[PDB]
Design a protein around this motif. Structure first.
Motif, PDB file in Angstrom:
ATOM      1  N   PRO A  85       0.818  -1.213   0.000  1.00 12.93           N
ATOM      2  CA  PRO A  85       0.000   0.000   0.000  1.00 12.93           C
ATOM      3  C   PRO A  85       0.850   1.261   0.000  1.00 12.93           C
ATOM      4  N   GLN A  86       0.125   2.334  -0.288  1.00 13.87           N
ATOM      5  CA  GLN A  86       0.706   3.666  -0.225  1.00 13.87           C
ATOM      6  C   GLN A  86      -0.087   4.424   0.840  1.00 13.87           C
ATOM      7  N   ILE A  87       0.646   4.798   1.860  1.00 13.39           N
ATOM      8  CA  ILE A  87       0.054   5.403   3.051  1.00 13.39           C
ATOM      9  C   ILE A  87       0.379   6.879   3.088  1.00 13.39           C
ATOM     10  N   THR A  88      -0.685   7.688   3.096  1.00 16.84           N
ATOM     11  CA  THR A  88      -0.350   9.113   3.126  1.00 16.84           C
ATOM     12  C   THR A  88      -0.178   9.469   4.606  1.00 16.84           C
ATOM     13  N   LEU A  89       0.257  10.699   4.771  1.00 15.65           N
ATOM     14  CA  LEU A  89       0.673  11.065   6.127  1.00 15.65           C
ATOM     15  C   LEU A  89      -0.146  12.171   6.722  1.00 15.65           C
ATOM     16  N   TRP A  90      -1.335  12.366   6.184  1.00 19.86           N
ATOM     17  CA  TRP A  90      -2.288  13.268   6.793  1.00 19.86           C
ATOM     18  C   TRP A  90      -2.627  12.841   8.218  1.00 19.86           C
ATOM     19  N   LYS A  91      -2.623  11.550   8.481  1.00 26.92           N
ATOM     20  CA  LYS A  91      -2.815  11.103   9.851  1.00 26.92           C
ATOM     21  C   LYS A  91      -1.727  10.098  10.201  1.00 26.92           C
ATOM     22  N   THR A 112       3.746  16.041   4.678  1.00 30.45           N
ATOM     23  CA  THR A 112       2.592  16.106   3.763  1.00 30.45           C
ATOM     24  C   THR A 112       2.794  17.209   2.726  1.00 30.45           C
ATOM     25  N   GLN A 113       3.413  18.319   3.121  1.00 26.04           N
ATOM     26  CA  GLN A 113       3.586  19.415   2.184  1.00 26.04           C
ATOM     27  C   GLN A 113       4.548  19.052   1.055  1.00 26.04           C
ATOM     28  N   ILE A 114       5.539  18.184   1.364  1.00 31.01           N
ATOM     29  CA  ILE A 114       6.484  17.830   0.309  1.00 31.01           C
ATOM     30  C   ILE A 114       5.994  16.600  -0.455  1.00 31.01           C
TER      31      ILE A 114
END
Ligand SMILES: CC(C)CN(C[C@@H](O)[C@H](Cc1ccccc1)NC(=O)O[C@H]1CO[C@H]2OCC[C@H]21)S(=O)(=O)c1ccc(N)cc1
Ligand SMILES: [Cl-]
Ligand SMILES: [Cl-]
Ligand code: NA
Lengths: 99, 99
Positions: free
Chosen positions: A1-7, B91-93
């Motif tokens: 998976p690709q996990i974003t880092l908003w949380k 997140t910004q980058i």
């Protein structure tokens, strides 16, 4: 998976027959789990971060299933506020940071 | 880039015209930098890490370059063992974790 880092990048792990929630932490050299029993030999260690150091028990050759991926390595156990999957096991599941 | 985790994911940052080394840290909510001077007013914040909490100085809307990528956001300053780039700037980058 690709996990974003908003949380926080939390996943389910299985360790010592137990399911736990843990943080995928590129800033952690080592994997640090809250107090639990693990089989085998251990040795005391200190690990340090913001706020200072905590005493942990270091267990080697422990298997953890991380978001469905098995890995083996050293796990330290102690009064961490959060279960942390550090680089020693993130490498084993092929985790990378991408931008 | 794609950063593997066999070594600490250290990058060069630029803040106030100065280059510094910092750790890309998915386990950090916040970006925490060692004592330096920053412009403007600051606000108080407590951050909790592995060994307890610390007080930091929170500065908002700080211009910071991270591994060549421009960010503008919150940086807190205090006694951290290493400069850490937390998810607020990851997140910004456009950083993600991938496995
Ligand atoms: C500070 C880093 C160099 C190292 N830390 C890992 C780090 O990701 C921790 C991991 C972490 C996460 C939560 C609580 C404790 C520790 N995050 C952290 O301190 O973040 C702080 C700044 O943002 C805030 O949001 C999270 C807590 C605050 S650490 O937990 O101290 C650590 C240190 C040594 C080992 N071997 C393993 C872990
Ligand atoms: Cl290991
Ligand atoms: Cl690899
Ligand atoms: Na062992």
């Amino acid at each position: 998976p690709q996990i974003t880092l908003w949380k926080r990048p939390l996943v389910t792990i299985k360790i010592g027959g137990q399911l736990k929630e843990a943080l995928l932490d590129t800033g952690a050299d080592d994997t640090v789990i809250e107090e639990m029993s693990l089989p085998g030999r251990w040795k005391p260690k200190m690990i340090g971060g913001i706020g200072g150091f905590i005493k942990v028990r270091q267990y080697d050759q422990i298997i953890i299933e991380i978001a469905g991926h098995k890995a083996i390595g050293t796990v330290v156990v102690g009064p961490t506020p959060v279960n942390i999957i550090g680089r020693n096991l993130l490498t084993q599941i092929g985790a990378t940071l991408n931008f």
